[PDB]
Amino acid sequence: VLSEGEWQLVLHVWAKVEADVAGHGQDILIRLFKSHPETLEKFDRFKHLKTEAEMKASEDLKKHGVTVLTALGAILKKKGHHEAELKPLAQSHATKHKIPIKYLEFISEAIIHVLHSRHPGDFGADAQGAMNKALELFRKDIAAKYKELGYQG
Numbered sequence: 001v002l003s004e005g006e007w008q009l010v011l012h013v014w015a016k017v018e019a020d021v022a023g024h025g026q027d028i029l030i031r032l033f034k035s036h037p038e039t040l041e042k043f044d045r046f047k048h049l050k051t052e053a054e055m056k057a058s059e060d061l062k063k064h065g066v067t068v069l070t071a072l073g074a075i076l077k078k079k080g081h082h083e084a085e086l087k088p089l090a091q092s093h094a095t096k097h098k099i100p101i102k103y104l105e106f107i108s109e110a111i112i113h114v115l116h117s118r119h120p121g122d123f124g125a126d127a128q129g130a131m132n133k134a135l136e137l138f139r140k141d142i143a144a145k146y147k148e149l150g151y152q153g
């Protein structure tokens with residue numbers, strides 16, 4: 001469990017992400033795709049993109065980054081009481097999009113890196129530790145749903 005102090009660190013940095021949801025979202029997806037090119041192949045929508053400049057120029061990619069971060073923010077603001085928000089996401093990602101849990105680890109690393117880049121004053125080691133713990137909780141709960149449905153591996 002995260003303590004209340006740990007959740008406060010998470011949500012204090014998240015409030016700053018919300019000042020520029022589209023810019024953060026774009027940066028996170030591009031870092032994922034560049035660091036782990038296998039992930040791009042899961043997106044029929046985006047797999048025509050071949051350079052960082054092309055990724056940065058895509059309005060549709062920017063729009064999807066907003067969708068991703070909006071959903072993640074709604075989960076974080078539940079402070080662990082996220083069953084209703086998380087279940088539908090797990091179901092779509094396991095059974096429709098066919099995303100392995102390992103790729104959820106990769107996007108978690110991309111989020112942490114981008115937050116460090118953009119918010120160094122509010123994203124010290126104590127806040128990095130708290131954010132890691134929040135994203136671990138997210139992954140643990142998705143993995144349980146995957147296991148029920150026959151997708152943990």
Ligand code: HEM
Nearest residue numbers: 039042043045067068071072089092093097099103104107
């Ligand atoms: C923080 C983690 C993630 C969040 C919050 C998230 C959220 C979402 C949301 C809200 C949607 C649209 C509704 C839906 O289809 O369920 C979506 C679509 C999708 N997600 Fe994710 N996602 C995450 C990670 C991933 C990862 C790591 C991958 C692939 C490597 C992925 C692949 C997809 C695909 C392929 C779609 C459909 C896109 C389209 O064709 O419009 N997601 N995701």
